[PDB]
Amino acid sequence: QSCVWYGECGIAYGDKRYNCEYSGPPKPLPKDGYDLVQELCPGFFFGNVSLCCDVRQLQTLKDNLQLPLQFLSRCPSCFYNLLNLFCELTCSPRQSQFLNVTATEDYVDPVTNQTKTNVKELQYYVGQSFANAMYNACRDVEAPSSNDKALGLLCGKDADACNATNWIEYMFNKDNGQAPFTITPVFSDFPVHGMEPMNNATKGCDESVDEVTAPCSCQDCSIVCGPKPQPPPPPAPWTILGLDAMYVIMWITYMAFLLVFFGAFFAVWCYRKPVSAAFEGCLRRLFTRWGSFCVRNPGCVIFFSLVFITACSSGLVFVRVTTNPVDLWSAPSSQARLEKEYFDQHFGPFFRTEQLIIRAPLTDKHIYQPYPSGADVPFGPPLDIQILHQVLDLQIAIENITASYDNETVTLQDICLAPLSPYNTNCTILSVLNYFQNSHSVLDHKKGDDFFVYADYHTHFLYCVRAPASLNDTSLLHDPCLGTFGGPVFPWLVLGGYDDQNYNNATALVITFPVNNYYNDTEKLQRAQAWEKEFINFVKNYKNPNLTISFTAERSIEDELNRESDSDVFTVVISYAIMFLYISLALGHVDSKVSLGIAGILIVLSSVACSLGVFSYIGLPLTLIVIEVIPFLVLAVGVDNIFILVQAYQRDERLQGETLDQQLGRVLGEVAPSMFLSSFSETVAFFLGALSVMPAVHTFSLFAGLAVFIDFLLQITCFVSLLGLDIKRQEKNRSCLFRFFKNSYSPLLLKDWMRPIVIAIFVGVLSFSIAVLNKVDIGLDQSLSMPDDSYMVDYFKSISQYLHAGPPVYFVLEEGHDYTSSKGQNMVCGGMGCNNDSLVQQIFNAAQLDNYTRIGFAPSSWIDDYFDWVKPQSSCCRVDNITDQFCNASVVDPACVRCRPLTPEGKQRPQGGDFMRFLPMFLSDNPNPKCGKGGHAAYSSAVNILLGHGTRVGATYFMTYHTVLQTSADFIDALKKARLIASNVTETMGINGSAYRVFPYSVFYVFYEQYLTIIDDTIFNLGVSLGAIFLVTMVLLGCELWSAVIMCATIAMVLVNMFGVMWLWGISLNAVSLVNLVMSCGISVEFCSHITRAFTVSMKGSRVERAEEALAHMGSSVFSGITLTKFGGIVVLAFAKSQIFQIFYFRMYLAMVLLGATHGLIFLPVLLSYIGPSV
Ligand SMILES: *[C@@H]1O[C@H](CO)[C@@H](O[C@@H]2O[C@H](CO)[C@@H](O)[C@H](O[C@H]3O[C@H](CO)[C@@H](O)[C@H](O)[C@@H]3O)[C@H]2NC(C)=O)[C@H](O)[C@H]1NC(C)=O
Ligand SMILES: *[C@@H]1O[C@H](CO)[C@@H](O[C@@H]2O[C@H](CO)[C@@H](O[C@@H]3O[C@H](CO)[C@@H](O)[C@H](O)[C@@H]3O)[C@H](O)[C@H]2NC(C)=O)[C@H](O)[C@H]1NC(C)=O
Ligand SMILES: *[C@@H]1O[C@H](CO)[C@@H](O[C@H]2O[C@H](CO)[C@@H](O)[C@H](O)[C@H]2NC(C)=O)[C@H](O)[C@H]1NC(C)=O
Ligand SMILES: *[C@@H]1O[C@H](CO)[C@@H](O[C@H]2O[C@H](CO)[C@@H](O)[C@H](O)[C@H]2NC(C)=O)[C@H](O)[C@H]1NC(C)=O
Ligand SMILES: CC(C)CCC[C@@H](C)[C@H]1CC[C@H]2[C@@H]3CC=C4C[C@@H](O)CC[C@]4(C)[C@H]3CC[C@]12C
Ligand SMILES: CC(C)CCC[C@@H](C)[C@H]1CC[C@H]2[C@@H]3CC=C4C[C@@H](O)CC[C@]4(C)[C@H]3CC[C@]12C
Ligand SMILES: *[C@@H]1O[C@H](CO)[C@@H](O)[C@H](O)[C@H]1NC(C)=O
Ligand SMILES: *[C@@H]1O[C@H](CO)[C@@H](O)[C@H](O)[C@H]1NC(C)=O
Ligand SMILES: *[C@@H]1O[C@H](CO)[C@@H](O)[C@H](O)[C@H]1NC(C)=O
Ligand SMILES: *[C@@H]1O[C@H](CO)[C@@H](O)[C@H](O)[C@H]1NC(C)=O
Ligand SMILES: *[C@@H]1O[C@H](CO)[C@@H](O)[C@H](O)[C@H]1NC(C)=O
Ligand SMILES: *[C@@H]1O[C@H](CO)[C@@H](O)[C@H](O)[C@H]1NC(C)=O
Ligand SMILES: *[C@@H]1O[C@H](CO)[C@@H](O)[C@H](O)[C@H]1NC(C)=O
Ligand SMILES: *[C@@H]1O[C@H](CO)[C@@H](O)[C@H](O)[C@H]1NC(C)=O
Ligand SMILES: *[C@@H]1O[C@H](CO)[C@@H](O)[C@H](O)[C@H]1NC(C)=O
């Protein structure tokens, strides 16, 4: 056997040369084009080659394969068979078996006068199962900038009826203009004329060609791609018989309660036919004696108390204020905080983002019609050419801003981040104008002639939203849309308002300005914030009636909070003014107590300032929010104690010749145990609520506890002396409620029929509260912490309404992994031979779910890219022969050799020291137009290399994006499921011990890690505070366990009803809701204590009469003392300016006050009447 048509001497036209005829033996290859044999069909290299082939023939094949390579190279198993059909067809060693030249003519040589016979025509025998396996396996390849089949672009006609036999005929036909001579294919599967066609092994778009080349994608093949994944949605509601299954357990219980209760009443109604006294007695004596002492030594007492106030409150000179949200809302040692500490150290902190959500309301969508052919494509309003010009103008102007600072200018070019610098230094700007490179000329330049435009910016947009990483349009335009900074711009980051793939339909435009964030550096942060201030002002004052901008900045939340935290002290001052007005006129009724009310307010403010100052000395910084919510609470408690004491005296009648000290000592000894119990129960409650892990609640709790305690002490002391002085005064000229409570309310409430109704109603409300308890929301909106008139609220609305991607995620593989071994790479890979449970594959599956696991996009790993780069076929890597230095992809090719040898052993992955030998050059590679993307603009940051000792790799991350996250529920779900993925990877890696582990890092993790344990945090906090209250009460009130248990049960009822009100007004259970509940459990005592003690210490006959006696006596002071004061306070606060107050403090306080009032003054009377301790 032998080949024909050897060499290429003839010429058809242009460069087309008819191959020369030569029917001799197959020519041993010259050892010269060994590389070509490894590129065209490596199936020939088993050296004795004896190939009929010629290198000018190999290179003219390669020249013809440019467009087929461009289309079918997407799926290697396809372009592989196509090659099998051409290499064998041209210079296979048994060419004569399946070939027969027909037409040949002399070719005169202008060099030798020697006639060389050209091959004008011949037939090529192709199997039918071969043409069938080829077309059917390549028929699915889609084209770029379209959703057609690449055969639609390679048949020469519509892709709907290009059969498999005709297309090969057209490919071999010179009628297209590419084939140098037309070949008539014969598709016979059996040897005819003694001529048997070629039938080599064949591979479809599903099977892979080599142990390193992944199969074709289901984008370009329909058979490879199967059933989608699906998670099971568990609601986990019990729903016993149709309803919440908690609505029924309670309704069922309540009916049982009402029957077992009225079935005992209506059942009896027919039946008509040293251990305690020793500690409670020394306190009375001590307090009487001390009150007498303070009443007869007023000068010394008041002077020492003022000296104490100043000595303690002068530490307010060292006051520091914390405004950085991380320190406020993040525990200094939480798991997420430690992960953020680890990420900022090895990869540098996450950058600062300044978004811009532009929208064009004044415009309608328009249609784009392709000239040659194609369905109509509608474009959203903002993708209009005029709107694009105006947005480009806005962006180019946003780049000017300089915002001088510290006597020096600070330009964006200076503060923004440029990944690949100092080679390219423009910087990262993520706008849809980067597809055109921010150029009016590039945006307007058209490539058509009158009556039609060939290409347009519509065409460019459509091509690169499909392929945003190209370096040229390569389709009648030949322009890249990679971006001025170098690196792709993903269409989901620069657009919004479209529908699930149709970036044509985008209704909004997103524009991001990434800025470097610095780790332990303040001049740079000051510089960035100084630029951001001017950016904000500019964007705020830009008019442009054609656009509706929703903007933000990294420093905008902090600015918003410093503006709301100073806009309500103007609120707190009116509150104290109304408190003083009420206190001055109501404290007894020149029967006016204005002088005494002023003294009480000054003692209270003194207590506030003193608390703040002592803790400033200790070093706890102020949150300025506390400094605003603390005064209200302290005023409430102080006014209650003052009124109790002053009124028991006012209501006290003097024995025989008593001057002043004896009466005051007697009144204080009989009133102090109660005031002391209330003050201590609240101090302990508050201090104990200062145990959670949140610096804002921690410090607030501490501050408020100390202020209340110090205020109690200072009041009881300076104020009892000053009360003695003022009582002496006025006795030289220098009740209507009590009648009611005893006269018409106490008797009514305690009748024998009204009591069962009241108890039933209150137990019913408690049952309701227990039923709807577990339906309380969890978390904070993050949009309600802002005023109403702010632009951040609008920005959050715009996000929720338009954006499609969320915050980026980094799956940080900690330091300690190998990376220099087959298995060490398989654990990390998302590739050919490495495992199916690897990190990248697991993140890929998670992204495939995208609703269950809130991870939206593929990992975009660096090791997969590195391997693609190092593969010899790619050829991007190329070293100098003598220097072992990185030869760029654009080089004269003087002496640079390929990095990996092009052999079967070199095809494998670089497992040994070549990995770490070539990795740095990759990470230093730039985006070369001939090579590709390079590994500098995307992975230089993502890979850490330790110098020396073999240059072992450090910590690396694989960053993907979250899905649009709109609510606290969304954020907590994202955190949880990211943790799940990380734990799976950590498990699968099978680490010896816990030397290292994978963990995900996102910006909001520190702010949302508290809601993964907030429920157990609430349980612990509430239980501990209530047990502390219980113990303090059962100790201080004597030793009666019955009174203490009744009071504790009433406060627990109050808390449960607090949770009911939470559910009912839409308050969430965050660390603020939790602080207020743990506080309320401490304020309830202030109500529940007076009534129960007035009941306990009484020696009348029946339970009803004891109840009415306690009600009259103490409740006349309790309704006027605590209720009205706290009510005036809350009604002034109802008009807030910061949202969080007006929602949580106002609602929580109104609920607490009115709930405690009702419980105390009604349910305590009746419950004691029924089951109170006898004596
Ligand atoms: C989201 O974008 C897609 C396309 O990117 C929109 O699909 C197109 O819908 C518009 C609506 O008018 C059609 O103009 C267009 O269909 C055109 O071409 C067909 C081809 O025969 C023609 O018969 C029609 O008359 C029309 O000219 C749609 N494109 C196709 C065929 O896919 C989709 O509607 C967008 N979503 C929204 C909210 O509009
Ligand atoms: C992932 O996100 C959500 C899953 O919660 C899915 O949302 C897609 O589109 C909108 C979202 O607002 C919803 O639309 C659906 O439209 C059809 C129209 O016929 C309607 O019959 C459905 O009842 C539903 O309203 C829907 O949440 C969702 N659509 C579908 C078909 O799921 C999204 O689809 C999810 N991704 C995948 C791949 O399912
Ligand atoms: C077509 O099939 C033939 C089968 O002989 C291939 O020829 C080689 O087959 C093996 C590699 O595929 C070699 O190990 C054999 O040495 C060699 N067989 C012969 C001719 O003796 C041929 O390579 C196939 N086509 C391609 C893709 O090269
Ligand atoms: C971004 O980098 C490009 C080069 O990569 C810089 O060069 C540009 O300079 C002018 C912009 O002011 C344009 O007129 C040039 O066309 C453009 N270079 C090329 C190749 O055309 C440019 O200065 C950088 N920034 C901007 C804003 O373009
Ligand atoms: C417009 C489309 C159809 C063109 C793509 C098909 C082209 C690239 C195919 C069809 C026929 C093929 C040619 C058939 C014959 C020869 C002669 C041989 O000694 C070198 C390869 C060469 C030159 C082939 C190059 C690739 C080729 C030209
Ligand atoms: C209110 C009492 C307990 C004092 C505490 C005041 C401060 C610490 C509270 C009040 C409002 C709160 C903010 C509410 C909203 C947000 C936006 C969110 O994306 C980050 C947390 C952050 C920033 C919270 C941090 C904590 C916060 C600032
Ligand atoms: C090739 O693939 C096509 C795709 O539909 C299929 O119809 C055809 O049967 C396949 N060829 C076979 C099975 O021989
Ligand atoms: C703003 O930018 C324009 C264009 O880059 C430039 O001409 C001008 O000097 C810059 N500064 C201005 C306008 O103050
Ligand atoms: C910067 O400071 C120097 C010295 O204080 C001063 O002379 C100079 O004017 C300042 N820069 C500008 C722009 O004014
Ligand atoms: C895109 O198109 C050209 C072909 O004209 C290609 O060679 C190159 O990769 C890109 N253009 C340039 C000028 O490099
Ligand atoms: C809006 O766009 C038009 C486009 O012609 C322009 O003339 C106008 O100045 C822009 N701003 C407006 C109308 O406020
Ligand atoms: C996954 O793990 C290995 C590698 O593929 C294999 O033993 C197993 O069958 C695979 N199965 C799936 C579903 O990935
Ligand atoms: C490249 O280096 C090899 C290694 O010794 C050497 O044999 C070869 O001659 C060198 N070629 C050139 C062009 O420097
Ligand atoms: C390519 O590498 C050469 C090596 O010296 C360098 O001079 C040139 O600037 C590089 N071009 C790129 C990275 O685009
Ligand atoms: C984590 O892995 C388990 C099996 O080990 C699997 O059941 C679960 O779905 C995985 N979680 C994901 C993929 O979020």
PDB file of C-alpha atoms and ligand atoms in Angstrom, residues 423 885-891 924-929, ligand 14:
ATOM      1  CA  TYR A 423       1.211  46.881  34.978  1.00  0.00           C
ATOM      2  CA  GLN A 885      12.527  32.647  33.620  1.00  0.00           C
ATOM      3  CA  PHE A 886       8.932  33.228  32.605  1.00  0.00           C
ATOM      4  CA  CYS A 887       8.720  33.918  28.889  1.00  0.00           C
ATOM      5  CA  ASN A 888       5.598  35.976  28.257  1.00  0.00           C
ATOM      6  CA  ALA A 889       2.975  34.746  25.802  1.00  0.00           C
ATOM      7  CA  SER A 890       3.801  37.716  23.544  1.00  0.00           C
ATOM      8  CA  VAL A 891       7.500  37.249  22.847  1.00  0.00           C
ATOM      9  CA  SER A 924       2.325  36.771  38.047  1.00  0.00           C
ATOM     10  CA  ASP A 925       0.937  36.245  34.527  1.00  0.00           C
ATOM     11  CA  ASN A 926      -1.076  39.098  33.015  1.00  0.00           C
ATOM     12  CA  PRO A 927      -4.137  39.041  30.747  1.00  0.00           C
ATOM     13  CA  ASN A 928      -2.370  38.453  27.452  1.00  0.00           C
ATOM     14  CA  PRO A 929      -4.570  38.600  24.324  1.00  0.00           C
TER      15      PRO A 929
HETATM   16  C1  LIG B  14       5.239  40.343  28.081  1.00  0.00           C
HETATM   17  O1  LIG B  14       6.466  39.988  28.716  1.00  0.00           O
HETATM   18  C2  LIG B  14       7.546  40.873  28.389  1.00  0.00           C
HETATM   19  C3  LIG B  14       8.787  40.315  29.046  1.00  0.00           C
HETATM   20  O2  LIG B  14       9.797  41.307  29.163  1.00  0.00           O
HETATM   21  C4  LIG B  14       7.219  42.289  28.850  1.00  0.00           C
HETATM   22  O3  LIG B  14       8.265  43.169  28.457  1.00  0.00           O
HETATM   23  C5  LIG B  14       5.894  42.746  28.255  1.00  0.00           C
HETATM   24  O4  LIG B  14       5.523  44.011  28.789  1.00  0.00           O
HETATM   25  C6  LIG B  14       4.807  41.721  28.550  1.00  0.00           C
HETATM   26  N1  LIG B  14       3.544  42.118  27.953  1.00  0.00           N
HETATM   27  C7  LIG B  14       2.368  41.904  28.551  1.00  0.00           C
HETATM   28  C8  LIG B  14       2.425  41.220  29.884  1.00  0.00           C
HETATM   29  O5  LIG B  14       1.308  42.245  28.042  1.00  0.00           O
END
